[PDB]
Amino acid sequence: WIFNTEIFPTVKEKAAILTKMLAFEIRGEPSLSKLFYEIVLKLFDQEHFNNTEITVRMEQPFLVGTRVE
Q1: Torsions phi, psi for 13 (to 5 deg)
Q2: How far apart are CA 56 and CA 28, in angstroms?
Q3: What own/partner pairs with CB < 8 Å and gap ≥ 24 does 39-46 have?
Q4: What sections of 28-68 are H helices per DSSP?
Q5: CB 56 within 8 A of CB 64
């Protein structure tokens, strides 16, 4: 979903569906959370001075991602 451009009309729906994936470490699933923080890290990889993300990826899962043991 995230890593391509299409007629999906806004990126806030991608943001709201990806921000829900912070329950993987709360419920106790390490592998799904590892994949999720890998794709958040890849979203921050292909950006130097860019907004290929939306700015809520810099807000919640980046900051929780600096804590993930």
Answers
A1: -70, -40
A2: 24
A3: 39/2, 40/65, 41/65, 42/3, 43/2, 43/3
A4: 30-43, 60-65
A5: no
